[PDB]
Design a binder for this molecule. Structure first.
Ligand SMILES: N#Cc1ccc(CNC=S)cc1
Ligand SMILES: N#Cc1ccc(CNC=S)cc1
Ligand SMILES: [Cl-]
Ligand SMILES: [Cl-]
Ligand SMILES: [Cl-]
Lengths: 114, 114, 114
């Protein structure tokens, strides 16, 4: 699993430990060892959501499997929950795009996961 | 709809109302209320197009539906047009990837759009 | 083809000519003229891989065709090889997501490639 957050929240408002917290929580939610989890946070972005530049986020979660209707609802609860608590972003100003990747379409260590 | 532009144009060359203009224009082009529209502009990027670092842009438009052959041609006219007029990027140095997202694969407000 | 790299490696560690090297090597690997190849490098990111902030990268390659099992393995060998040699990122701390884009879903020069 790879989780990216792009947000207009400033860097100083990303708290210490947020990357580890994301990593642990995604491990828990996906059932995957945290060694396999990548996270990426991009603050200070020039963004609007609904025409407004109050705090918002555009995110992606790519995963080889573990993507589907109920799982995605459960990830969205968790992740919006973290972004609200840690970054003070209202859940209704967050979009998270979920991508179920084929193993053959993920490269790693000079090969792919196929 | 979510529209992201990554460009090597500098921040100072992005004009003041550009995020609202993109939002209104996308609202008009997709038939969707502007409350549902997200936009993100990433200037000062290290990029090349055709091996050259003259102004260029890599973009994406994600939408739940409203994606297809004719619609995409129409969005490309509109968006290249805006990027040419506002950011002074030649349309032939712009790529825009279109993604038709399933509602179940877009998270928002602690749940998905399914 | 479009190739994007996000990495926590600092901008000063990206060597001169890296964008042009990426362009040429992708041209060679894909069989596509370098005129149509876009590359984008994003350093200084706030990222973790396996919970660690040692050097890593998250990447993507979008291409209209030229995506598949053996080709992706071959692209991964090349790209991880470059990132190791030029940016000193261990191949086992790189993910590259491959996307086979439909021509109708790629915009360019006020139209699409359909
Ligand atoms: N099976 C399997 C599998 C699933 C995910 C990954 C990479 N980790 C997150 S995308 C690597 C291997
Ligand atoms: N139906 C429907 C629908 C379409 C799009 C969105 C989010 N807005 C842009 S991606 C939310 C719901
Ligand atoms: Cl290039
Ligand atoms: Cl939509
Ligand atoms: Cl991690």
């Amino acid at each position: 699993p790879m989780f990216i957050v792009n947000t207009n929240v400033p860097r100083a408002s990303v708290p210490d430990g947020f990357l580890s917290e994301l990593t642990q929580q995604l491990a828990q939610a996906t059932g995957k060892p945290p060694q396999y989890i990548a996270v990426h946070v991009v603050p200070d972005q020039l963004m609007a959501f609904g025409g407004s530049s109050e705090p918002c986020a555009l995110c992606s979660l790519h995963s080889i499997g573990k993507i589907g209707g109920a799982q995605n609802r459960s990830y969205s609860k968790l992740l919006c929950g973290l972004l609200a608590e840690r970054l003070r972003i209202s859940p209704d100003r967050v979009y998270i795009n979920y991508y179920d990747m084929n193993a053959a379409n993920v490269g790693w260590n000079n090969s792919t996961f196929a």
